[PDB]
Amino acid sequence: TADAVLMIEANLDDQTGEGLGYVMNQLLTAGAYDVFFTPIQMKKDRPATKLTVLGNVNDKDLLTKLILQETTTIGVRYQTWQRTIMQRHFLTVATPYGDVQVKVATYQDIEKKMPEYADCAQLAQQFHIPFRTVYQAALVAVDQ
Amino acid sequence: TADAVLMIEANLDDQTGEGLGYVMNQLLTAGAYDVFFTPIQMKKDRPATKLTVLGNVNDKDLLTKLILQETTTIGVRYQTWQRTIMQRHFLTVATPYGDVQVKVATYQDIEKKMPEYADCAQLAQQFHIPFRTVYQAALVAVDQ
Amino acid sequence: TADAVLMIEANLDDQTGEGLGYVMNQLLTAGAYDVFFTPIQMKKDRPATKLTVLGNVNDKDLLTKLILQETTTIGVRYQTWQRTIMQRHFLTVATPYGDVQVKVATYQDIEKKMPEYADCAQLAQQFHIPFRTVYQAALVAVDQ
Amino acid sequence: TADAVLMIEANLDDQTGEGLGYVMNQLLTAGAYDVFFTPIQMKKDRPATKLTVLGNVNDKDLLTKLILQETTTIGVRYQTWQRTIMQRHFLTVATPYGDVQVKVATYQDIEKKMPEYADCAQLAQQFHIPFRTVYQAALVAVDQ
Amino acid sequence: TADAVLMIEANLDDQTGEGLGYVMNQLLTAGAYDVFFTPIQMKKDRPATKLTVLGNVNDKDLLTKLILQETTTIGVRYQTWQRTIMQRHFLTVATPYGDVQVKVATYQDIEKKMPEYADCAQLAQQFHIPFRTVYQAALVAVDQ
Amino acid sequence: TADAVLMIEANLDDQTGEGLGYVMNQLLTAGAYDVFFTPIQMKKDRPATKLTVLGNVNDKDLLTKLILQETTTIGVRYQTWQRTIMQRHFLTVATPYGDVQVKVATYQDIEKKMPEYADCAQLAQQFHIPFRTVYQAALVAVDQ
């Protein structure tokens, strides 16, 4: 399918990383689609960080306000981007360690399957096997 | 308030950092709002740098020409972004080390205060105390 | 001259670098103008990579499909950017090591010359001199 | 004072960030002093990640086996570094938003105070004030 | 087991990525165990690159002279690191797309299997299937 | 030749780039051989910076105390590295834009010449020509 997404950016040369991990969780809590950090270099020998937020266009006011309230930035910049998304569906698969949800993504003539992280990570911690072991066991089980 | 900003980008896989520090100062001298470096990885095992310039839209021709004249790039790409900016005002505050300008930023119902860097850095160098000491003394003094 | 370019982006927190070097060569093989990697930091302590592709706007469907087929991403985002490009021409120059193609770039009143990489690299490997030696010999020879 | 710390490194070009965020939690849980990710660029156009682990030098075997079991790497490299650490103790300080434990670090004639994050984050989420507001409120409060 | 590897580093702020990709190929050709690029930020607003070379400690002179001849740097620094490497051997495994050599690495009681990239890339380009498809097909196949 | 250099490192997740650019100027002023910033990713979703300082090994105390006084870090780690440095001397060379001091570096049978930046930058700003133009003009001029 197709949709649109707002991208909000901010350059922070006077902001600590501690506060940035806080703002990333606030934004995700607020419903941002995605949030990420880009290492950038700014004037006067400043190692800096660019904060990027992807979100719903109707959420523009909320995520702007969070950024302006929680970080040191005086302004933000935003742009709308177009999107092309694959259609999702999930299969639950039985492994020696429990059920594992596999996300099957399709688009036109593409079909691919991603074992979900939280499932694999929870079971590996429960039976103390490596995360790759649960992952591989999920692939093996989705063979049928 | 609200405004618009042009963003100009360039990928440089055949450009030294020495020349890049020169171009960043030329652009800031020319009135760029902001200029930053993003580390990027390009084809044929090239560690590269993306040069981003933010500027006034009527300055598009100048900053383009600077980039094309001073760097190795054959083309630049540019886009206009929308902005949401907080309203600024400054308070000058008295510290045991001298006056320090505090930038108070407001937007709707947000109010935050940033001690200015050059003020704090100049006074710390003058009295050889750590930059954090002048910073904290500025916060303390803006308490009233 | 002037033209427009599509920019396609994708954030990959569940993708290996091996597969990324493969997708970068597939995209360049498919006619992408440029492809690059940006190191980014995503949620849940994930060091991640942003994949950026620049391309012809009529190639949007191909490069999207490559990204969605070959990487783990569920969606891509794209935007059109405007371009300002210099006019190219090439001079072939004679060096003690052979002919070397120099790319001369002009725009309005700017004129700059870039010795081409593959030429210099091939000759340096053939006569085992440093790449800088062939480069400098090319500049010296384009003096006339 | 003087002390030592083991540094373990591993270059991972075939490892997802998802798995990397997982192994970072395993390593801290395993008693690593610190763990961090450095973006690096490896052969064959691979965007990659360097994993660095700091720990007690007697933990070489523990943290070695953890890295070899949970990540994809064939080998790790390790070296001992000397350390100089400040003395810590904590003060509870009264702020307009509540008490905050401030961390006081000393070394010879150096003394600096860092308000603790979790306290500040705790008060900020409880009173819907910005994290920067409480942090600064603590700094000002720690003046006496 | 236990072993040692020489690490050579050099900070390059006046070196293009083009030349860096070239020297990376020279170094691997010269018998370096590994080579990678780290983005770093140096004085005077310079976006720069750290070159790290791993090699046999008896190669100090070879790889030193290579770095000093082919790059722009005035000096390099080097240190010996200890290593812990897993035992490798290769299995050919039958997949729906063909045979794939899988790399089996062992250390004490740890055993993990990584399908090889070039085989997977070879089958993927031949049958126009995604690299992730063959890799997963190998993982599932290597279960027995 | 052979020599040694002290390397001091510190991981800073609660430190602004503003303060980092400041401490970089303090460190160079304090006689550090070199200082650079590496973007790193630390626990709890923190975009962070690694500070590396190179110096004389007898400066351990000077540069240690500087880092502990001016930055936020609780500890630093340090190690001695061996060095191999080329011999420098400077030539003044005649270019169409003026005389430029070129730096000639030697080691055994290796000889390379790097025109100096500040001279090139000086002539470029004076005659409004590109820095790449003067640099290349120097390279060509240094052929004899």
Curated annotation (Swiss-Prot), chains A, B, C, D, E, F:
This is Pyridinium-3,5-bisthiocarboxylic acid mononucleotide nickel insertion protein. Belongs to the LarC family. It comes from the Bacteria. The gene is larC. Disruption phenotype: Deletion of this gene leads to a loss of lactate racemase activity. Induction: Induced by L-lactate and repressed by D-lactate. Is thus regulated by the L-lactate/D-lactate ratio. Makes part of the lar operon (larABCDE). It comes from Lactiplantibacillus plantarum (strain ATCC BAA-793 / NCIMB 8826 / WCFS1) (Lactobacillus plantarum). Involved in the biosynthesis of a nickel-pincer cofactor ((SCS)Ni(II) pincer complex). Binds Ni(2+), and functions in nickel delivery to pyridinium-3,5-bisthiocarboxylic acid mononucleotide (P2TMN), to form the mature cofactor. Is required for the activation of the lactate racemase LarA. May also be involved in the activation of other nickel-pincer cofactor-dependent enzymes.
